[PDB]
Amino acid sequence: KIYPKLHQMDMDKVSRVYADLRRESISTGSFPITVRHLESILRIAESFAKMRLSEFVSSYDLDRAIKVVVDSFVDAQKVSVRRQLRRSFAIYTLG
Amino acid sequence: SVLAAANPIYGRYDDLKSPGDNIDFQTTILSRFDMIFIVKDDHNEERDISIANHVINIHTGNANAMQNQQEENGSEISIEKMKRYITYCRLKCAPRLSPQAAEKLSSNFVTIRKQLLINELESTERSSIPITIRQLEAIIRITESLAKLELSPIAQERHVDEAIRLFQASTMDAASQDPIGGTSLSEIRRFEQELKRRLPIGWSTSYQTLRREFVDTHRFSQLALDKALYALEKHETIQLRHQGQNIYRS
Amino acid sequence: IQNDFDLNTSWIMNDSEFPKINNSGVYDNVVLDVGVDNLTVNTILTSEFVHDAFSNDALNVLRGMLKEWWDEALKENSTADLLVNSLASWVQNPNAKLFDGLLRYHVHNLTKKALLQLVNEFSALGSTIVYADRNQILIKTNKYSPENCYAYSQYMMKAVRTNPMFSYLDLNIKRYWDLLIWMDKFNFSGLACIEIEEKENQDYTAVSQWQLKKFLSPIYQPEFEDWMMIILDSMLKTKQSYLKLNSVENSLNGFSHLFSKPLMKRVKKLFKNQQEFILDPQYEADYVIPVLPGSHLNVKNPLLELVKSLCHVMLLSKSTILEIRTLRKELLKIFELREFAKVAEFKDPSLSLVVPDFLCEYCFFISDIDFCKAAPESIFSCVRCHKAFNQVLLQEHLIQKLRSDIESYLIQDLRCSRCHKVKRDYMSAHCPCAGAWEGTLPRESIVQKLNVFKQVAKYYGFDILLSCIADL
Amino acid sequence: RDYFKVINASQQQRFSYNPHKMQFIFVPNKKQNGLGGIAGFLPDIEDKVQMFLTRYYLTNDRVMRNENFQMSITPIKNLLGRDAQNFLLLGLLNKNFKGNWSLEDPSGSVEIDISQTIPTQGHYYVPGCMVLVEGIYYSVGNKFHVTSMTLPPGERREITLETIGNLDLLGIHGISNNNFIARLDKDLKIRLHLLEKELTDHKFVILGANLFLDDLKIMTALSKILQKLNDDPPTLLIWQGSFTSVPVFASMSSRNISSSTQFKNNFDALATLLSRFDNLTENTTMIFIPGPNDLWGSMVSLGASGTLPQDPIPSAFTKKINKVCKNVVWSSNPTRIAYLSQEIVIFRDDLSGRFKRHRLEFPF
Ligand SMILES: [Zn+2]
Ligand SMILES: [Zn+2]
């Protein structure tokens, strides 16, 4: 029954995060990031909205989704750069 | 008509790898095709910002409005009207060439054939994307299809130039892209020492004088130009300005 | 042949800009403010195929001339000293006979190379370059107390002087910085001591030079200065506490905890008062946005720019970024805005228009001058001597700069779109590959430059420059 | 006299050209339809791309209209596949990036050969000029072995006009615009016959170049000329050449008179010298033409050659001549005046040395 809707979300935060993920990545490492992951972030946000039986996506759900995606990306690198990337990406998921 | 989508070996194109072993299609099958487009991914963060904004807006919450205005200001037409227009044009028109267009086509074909021979002679292996008479027929058909858009009985230079531009794009993107594939390099080090030794930062020399001196020595003309444009491509401390005469060292 | 126009010559006359280095940030370490003198003479004395080369025979001749000049000036000769002082002004000035642009370009290039070599030498030991210029160099010292940098600074100066390349440099130390908040030449604040003394605690005087404060509403500038003083005092207190205890540095970590709640309450009161008294007719005097040459930002709510500046000055720490971001988000929650909105992004409220190498005959002193960012009572007077400049010379040099800009734009080259190769055909539709030509110099840049020329000519009384523009 | 005008290069009407239709096309003036509040005089990027195309198009049309040529020329690019055959071509003769002489065409470019070239004497073969080339192509390299070079011929005013009727390019009776095109030939003979009478009374006199307003000898000579010219004032008096013997630029001395102030002072004396010649001032109009090293050019070129469409003398430095004399006009370096049936172009610069120094050499 529940179909969430997506209106009041930050355009610039998500766009800048996608730009940052396009940076580093293949330009420094090997994991591929494409436009599919932006839609994945949106889908995870909609799923988190679904879990509350809510018809509209709030900001906290977007924060949870972006935290999950950033953590999953950063926790799959070498041990030489993991701490550096962890402190580099800490500005998007302050909470 | 066949519209085919395919992926190269190893996923991404891997430009550092030779173009010969990134595509597994034989020469015969590629000849029948006449528009080969290699779409590569790139990162500069401005196109990335634009694409992110485009997708974020195209989420159904907003696009459902904006596209409507495209049908209200007359900037675009609906799909069914386009279908009617294409079937009408297919039924009615069938354009034809002109002698000036034929001469331009012949000259362009000879030029591209000679450039292909030059690239093959430098590379010393057979090109993975061939150029044959089928490509000339292809360019002719592209010109005729372009003339067919406006229901013009006769095809002229205005369509031929755009067709030649499209073929140049689809050729320089795939066939003639990095033909070198990355005397050997012993001279390469030997040259690069001489420029640093004899040409300091901020000064410049004429192209003709450097070419003259290095053809006078063992370097010769062919070796100089390739790494000249390579060091320009490196762009760390070599800049071109004022046509092809001022070799500025940045 | 010299009367004929040529591309290389026209490029070598008008490339007179001197680059500089500026690394923003907050430093809890001691910083040495030094000055370099007689750089050009040292550069001259120290150190076929290439067509832009100046005749080395004349260069060696003048080097020997200057060497005997220096030797004679050493042995009690006022005339030789004065002539050596005027040598640089002779080199720059084209009105003097026997002038050549190639020699001037060669000298300038050698001076730039010497300056970068000096920077490299200063970077060999433990040091950090904060700012660099032809006249001023700021160097970060690894130590923490100014009293412990006496022999350190003296030994560094001695080692620099003893080097054969820098034998003729004169180095003077002006100020010692206990704690610095550096973001730009015209925008810094910190605590400084003139010269460290013995057995006595040094006299510390705080300075606050912020041209950014001039772009605020006449009612929020007292708040700006008060809060800046408060935060600087808090930073001093926390650094002193950390030092007394013994990319992270616990000298500053944890300084915003002292004033966060009072700042929040003050921002709430300011917002309420602005909401109540913004549309009143008699209270509209203090909310009028000032206009100053080089300004290009059109803004509505002054409190937003007040808090944006108060947060951007904080954001220079580069080590306590998370705390500053949390405080910024909390401040933005007072407004009905969000963290990553465009309206909540700080920019530079002023443009830049710099005239390079303005000469003071009373000093033979060479420095740039910024017509937009620099405050008055300094455009019209020399930096060292307090002698008034001649105004028609300033206006004439501005006209020269504008005309040179127009010519440089008109003489630009064309670059392809997809590949960045240069156009090598006198006439062709487009690149052999896909893509159309574009110019190296965009139109919007020169349009904005002409706009800032209009603003500058309107702020001061410059009739000749106005007539110069009107003739176009 | 009336019914004549003097126009500069800034206000000249803009007419483009199109090869495929072979007509001149009016272009709207950016001054009239555009705003121009801040910066409207800056040309856009593609103008430098199209300028050589337009020049080549006009030259090719002029060549094709010739009586002799009805033999046919061939494009450069069509020379790729054939050899051992003679051809006729024309294009920009210049130097390539390598350092050899080449011919450029809207289609392509080739390399030239000069070792056995016999020219048509009486022509200054300078790089950058269109030349008709005859020779044999060889595919061993890319060498076009030339046997003769000749500049394209010319045409007269009447035949040039009649192809476009009698267009009002320098239109004094009427002007054209984007909406429509105009023409007129009925009043031309009337104006010709009007010119045939009272033409001796309507005399105009021109002086030499580089007249300096600083030395005493030139002022004495000018006074001697003016005392002779006062009794019989001409119609148009044209002052041409550089009015200051030293180029004006930045002044680095604050102890003596600045260059701009001295330049202003040089014209204030002319206002005094015109006070004793009220007949010439009252009955004759003044024309001033900038030279190589006036205020605007020498400001950046420092007395050397530079941009050709020079701005007129600035109004801030001629605030007394316009009040002393009732008719003074400042024009650009190229200026156009339109009489009743005559059009005049004045072009002040050096040509002999420019053509002599850069003359291309022919082995013999
Ligand atoms: Zn001074
Ligand atoms: Zn290109």
Chain B residue numbers with beta carbons less than 8 Å from the beta carbon of A19 are: 45, 48-49, 52
Structure tokens at C397: 């040099």
Burial of B193 (C-beta count, 10 Å sphere; 0-12/13-18/19+): exposed
Of B116, B208, B240, which to mutate for an interface test with D (greatest number of D Cβ within 10 Å)? Answer: B208
Strand partners, D119: D149
Check: CB of residue B46 under 8 Å from CB of residue A12: no
Residue A27 three-state SS: helix
Smallest CA–CA separation between A15 and chain B, in Å?
A: 5
Q: Shortest Cα distance from A53 to chain C (angstroms)?
A: 25
Count Cα atoms within 13 angstroms, Cβ side, for D165.
Answer: 12
Distance CA C430, CA B240 (A): 19
Q: Is C432's CB within 8 Å of B172's CB?
A: yes
Q: Please report residues of A whose CB lies closer than 8 A to that of B63.
A: none
Burial group, residue D142, by CB count within 10 angstroms (0-12, 13-18, 19+): middle
Neighbours of C74 (CB within 10 A): 10
Q: What's the CA gap between D121 and D362, in Å, rounded?
A: 12
Estimate the crossing angle of helix B133-149 against helix B99-123, to 10 degrees. 140
Residue C205 CA: distances (Å) to CA of C88, C173, C235: 37, 17, 15
In angstroms, what is the span from residue C425 Cα to ligand 2's centroid?
A: 13
Distance D252 CA to ligand 1 centre (A): 13
H or E element in which residue B184 lies: none
Angstroms from D8 CA to nearest CA on chain C: 14
Distance CA(A1)–CA(A50), nearest Å, equals 10
- Measured CA to CA in angstroms, residue D203 lies from C397, D278, D281 at distances of 44, 18, 15
Chain C partners (3+ C-beta pairs within 8 A): A, B, D
* Cβ-defined contact of B56 to A22 (cutoff 8 Å): no
3-state SS, one letter per residue, for D288-355? EECCCCCCCCCCCCCCCCCCCCCCCCCHHHCCCHHHHCCCEEECCCEEEEECCCCEEEEECCCCHHHH
Report d(CA D293, CA D244) in Å as an integer: 8
- This entry's atomic model was obtained through cryo-EM
Nearest CA in chain A to C328: A94
Is C468 annotated to bind a ligand? Reply is no
- Give the integer Cα–Cα distance in Å for C229 and C207: 10
Distance between B133 CA and the closest CA of chain D, angstroms: 16
Which of D129, D156, D157 shows the shortest CA–CA distance to D55?
Answer: D129
Instruction: Give the β-pairing of D285-289 and D328-330.
Output: parallel
Distance CA B43, CA A19 (A): 9
Q: Between the CA of residue C37 and those of C41, C166, C459, D194, D359, what are the distances in Å? A: 9, 11, 35, 77, 51
Distance CA B37, CA B228 (A): 29
Q: Does B244 contact C at CB distance below 8 Å?
A: yes
The bridge status of strand D236-240 relative to strand D204-206 is parallel
Long-range CB contact pairs, B209-213, < 8 A, 24+: B209/C49, B209/C51, B210/B247, B210/C49, B211/D98, B211/D99, B213/C49
CB contact under 8 A, D92 and C426: yes
What is the Cα Rg of chain A in Å? 14
Distance CA D218, CA A49 (A): 93
Backbone φ and ψ of C182, nearest 5°: -110, 125
> Using CA atoms, how far apart are residues D128 and D99, in angstroms rounded to an integer?
15
Q: Which long-range contacts (CB under 8 A, 24 or more apart) does D70-76 make?
A: D75/D105, D75/D106, D75/D107, D75/D108, D76/D103, D76/D104, D76/D105, D76/D107, D76/D108, D76/D109, D76/D110
- Substitution target in A5, A7, A15, A28 with the highest count of B β-carbons within 10 Å is A15
Task: Scan for tokens 């354009």, then name that residue.
Answer: B95
DSSP secondary structure of D133-199:
EEEEE-SSSSEEEEEEEE------HHHHHHBTBSB-TT-SS----SS---B--HHHHHHHHHHTSS-
β-strand partners of D285: D236
Q: Interhelix angle for C39-46 vs C78-92, to 10°?
A: 90
Nearest ligand to residue C380 Cα:
1
Whether residue C191 contacts residue C177, with contact meaning beta carbons closer than 8 Å, is answered with yes
What residue ranges do the domains of chain D occupy? 4-67+152-364, 71-151
Report the residue from A14, A22, A39 with minimal CB separation from B45.
A22
Q: Is C311 annotated as a binding residue?
A: no
How far, in Å, from the CA of C161 to the mean position of ligand 1?
Answer: 26
Give the experimental resolution in Å: 3.7
In sequence order, what are the beta bridge partners of D16? Answer: D25
Task: Tell how far the Cα of C239 is from the centroid of ligand 1, in angstroms.
Answer: 40
Among D104, D255, D306, the residue with its CB nearest the CB of C427 is D104
For helices B46-58 and A11-22, the axis angle rounded to 10 degrees is 140
| Cα–Cα distances in angstroms (integers) from residue C259 to residues C195, C231, C254, C255, C316, in the given order | 32, 8, 11, 8, 18
